[PDB]
Curated annotation (Swiss-Prot):
This is NACHT, LRR and PYD domains-containing protein 3. Sensor component of the NLRP3 inflammasome, which mediates inflammasome activation in response to defects in membrane integrity, leading to secretion of inflammatory cytokines IL1B and IL18 and pyroptosis. In response to pathogens and other damage-associated signals that affect the integrity of membranes, initiates the formation of the inflammasome polymeric complex composed of NLRP3, CASP1 and PYCARD/ASC. Belongs to the NLRP family. Induction: By activators of Toll-like receptors, such as lipoteichoic acid (LTA) (TLR2), polyinosine-polycytidylic acid (poly(I:C), a synthetic analog of dsRNA) (TLR3) and bacterial lipopolysaccharides (LPS) (TLR4), and by TNF. Up-regulated in osteoblasts after exposure to invasive, but not invasion-defective, strains of Salmonella typhimurium (at protein level). In macrophages, up-regulated by endocannabinoid anandamide/AEA. (Microbial infection) In COVID-19 patient derived macrophages, expression is induced by SARS-CoV-2 spike protein, probably via TLR2 (at protein level). The lineage of its organism: Eukaryota, Metazoa, Chordata, Craniata, Vertebrata. The chain holds residues 134 to 676 of 1036 of the full protein. It is linked to Familial cold autoinflammatory syndrome 1: A rare autosomal dominant systemic inflammatory disease characterized by recurrent episodes of maculopapular rash associated with arthralgias, myalgias, fever and chills, swelling of the extremities, and conjunctivitis after generalized exposure to cold. Rarely, some patients may also develop late-onset renal amyloidosis. Changing A56Q: Abolished binding to small-inhibitor MCC950 and ability to activate the NLRP3 inflammasome following stimulation with nigericin.
Amino acid sequence: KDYRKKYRKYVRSRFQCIELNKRYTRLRLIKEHPIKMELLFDPDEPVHTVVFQGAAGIGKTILARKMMLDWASGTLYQDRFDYLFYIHCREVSLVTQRSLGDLIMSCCPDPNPPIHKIVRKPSRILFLMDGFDELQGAFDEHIGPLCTDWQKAERGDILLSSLIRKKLLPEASLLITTRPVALEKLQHLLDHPRHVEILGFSEAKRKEYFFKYFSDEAQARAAFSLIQENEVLFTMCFIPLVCWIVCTGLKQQMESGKSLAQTSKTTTAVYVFFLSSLLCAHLWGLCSLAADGIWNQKILFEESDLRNHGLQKADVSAFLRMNLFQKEVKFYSFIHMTFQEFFAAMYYLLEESRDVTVLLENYGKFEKGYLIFVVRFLFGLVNQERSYLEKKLSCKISQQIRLELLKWIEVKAKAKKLQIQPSQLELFYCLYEMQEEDFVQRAMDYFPKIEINLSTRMDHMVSSFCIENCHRV
Ligand SMILES: CC(C)(O)c1csc(S(=O)(=O)NC(=O)Nc2c(-c3cccc(Cl)c3Cl)ccc3c2CCC3)c1
Ligand SMILES: Nc1ncnc2c1ncn2[C@@H]1O[C@H](COP(=O)(O)OP(=O)(O)O)[C@@H](O)[C@H]1O
């Protein structure tokens, strides 16, 4: 345990704040579809593979980092593990060749760590695979041949396919967080996995977060009230990212005299609500970036990367960094993947914006990025009656794109469901964004018979909005 102490200290160092350790709200977990974190690995004969289905922005990354902090502070798995390695998939190549040791040695504080004494005992090692989806580039069952040597340098996709199929440190423990969609690629790999669902806050712990954001007990009460009276923002705030998006927007209108109000009905109109809360001159550049980034599988941007797309004289430094960027290690990423997809979407709808027919030929593909929010938003945006920023929008070029989205929904509504995505519900979400009734009802035609997969009460809404638009008398 000479080095174990040094390693644990380093882990407390990196994982002590989300991006201190204070505003964390207990997210809801459900096994076999309420599990204590410690009890996860315990047998039903022990477990070597856990997977957290997590919706984007539900705090899967935070919940991970917390497990790291708690263990790194002796709170949980003191007895079960000697080492927890946090792998941020976002960062790791899938083409680069590397060894399990090379990948491991990066997790460590010092430069030449005792790697051979770490692997000594793998039954005491847990890898935290954070955002299996955030992996950039293709991934397919086809990949081979599978590796069996930790010291051997395969290219990332092989190496991980080998680690996940438990061929590399078989009796390692492994905890993968992932988006629901990316479960299709990953389901086959898993060695007898234990599935867990991150659900986000409850109604209670929805309250809890507001009074953890709002320093003043009154400013907190007045700004949770909005969200009971509003229906969308209540349903919509079981999700933590929204909660933040919402309360960072209730805080400069907490600055101004504007008696608090957000009458937002759609996800797009909440992003755009918050997007405006932080307000132009370099607007074109951001959207330029995100849409090369999504297309070219880059979630992390270097300074150099930035100077090309725009900010030729220190725009990012002041204008954007405040709330729309995060700096990692010298490299920069958007405060969330979604906001990237947004500007990537929003990039196709502006004053002189590329070809849209391209995007749709490959919707729901892993390697080009799922493009869930790429699509989903630019229905809620292209919407004619849906602002101020509405200006930067090209009024004329909008119903260029609006007229093909309907061609593509039509295709997808009544096929043999060749592709998995879009599952009907996603099209409903596309449709609840594109709030224009006439467009919705017309699309509703194309569905012969509908099919519901309702988990949460947000699902219930988006669905039950579209249902009545269906009727053809
Ligand atoms: C059905 C299918 C396949 O479209 C789907 C299922 S979850 C995903 S996702 O991985 O894209 N995650 C999200 O969309 N998360 C969401 C959802 C949401 C939508 C639908 C289901 C659920 Cl549970 C949630 Cl939280 C609603 C609002 C916001 C976010 C993040 C930004 C604000 C897609
Ligand atoms: N348990 C939590 N307590 C407080 N805020 C949270 C929590 N979970 C998520 N958040 C908020 O959501 C944001 C994004 O969460 P993150 O885990 O990065 O999402 P994902 O991993 O699904 O992309 C965080 O920056 C934080 O503001």
